[PDB]
């Protein structure tokens, strides 16, 4: 179709707050994870994963969760 329209809308507290809820319903390894979270949030797979990935990248956790420098 020649005619075209805008793409996908930005992220809003609503969409940013819902994601956390969906992520729980569809954890990692699950078949169609992003495919399910998107249908729930109302966005496109890439649209979601592309957003979540940013959240997983910028986080606050130990620089290296290690057990010990030397056993023996």
Swiss-Prot record:
Modified residues (Phosphoserine): 62
Domain SANT: 8-60
Domain of life: Eukaryota
Compartment list: Endoplasmic reticulum membrane; Nucleus membrane; Microsome membrane
Subunit (UniProt): Interacts (via J domain) with HSPA5. Interacts (via cytosolic domain) with ribosomes. Interacts (via SANT 2 domain) with SERPINA3; the interaction delays the formation of the covalent inhibitory complex SERPINA3-chymotrypsin, but does not alter the catalytic activity of SERPINA3. Interacts (via SANT 2 domain) with ITIH4 (via C-terminus); the interaction protects ITIH4 against in vitro cleavage by kallikrein.
Chain's role: May modulate protein synthesis.
The protein's name: DnaJ homolog subfamily C member 1
Included stretch of the parent chain: 327 to 385 of 554
């Amino acid at each position: 179709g020649s005619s075209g329209s805008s793409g996908a809308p930005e992220w809003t507290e609503e969409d940013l707050s819902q994601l956390t809820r969906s992520m729980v319903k569809f954890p990692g390894g699950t078949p169609g994870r992003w495919e399910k979270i998107a249908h729930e949030l109302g966005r496109s797979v890439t649209d979601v994963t592309t957003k979540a990935k940013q959240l997983k990248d910028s986080v606050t956790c130990s620089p290296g969760m290690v057990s010990g420098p030397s056993s023996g």
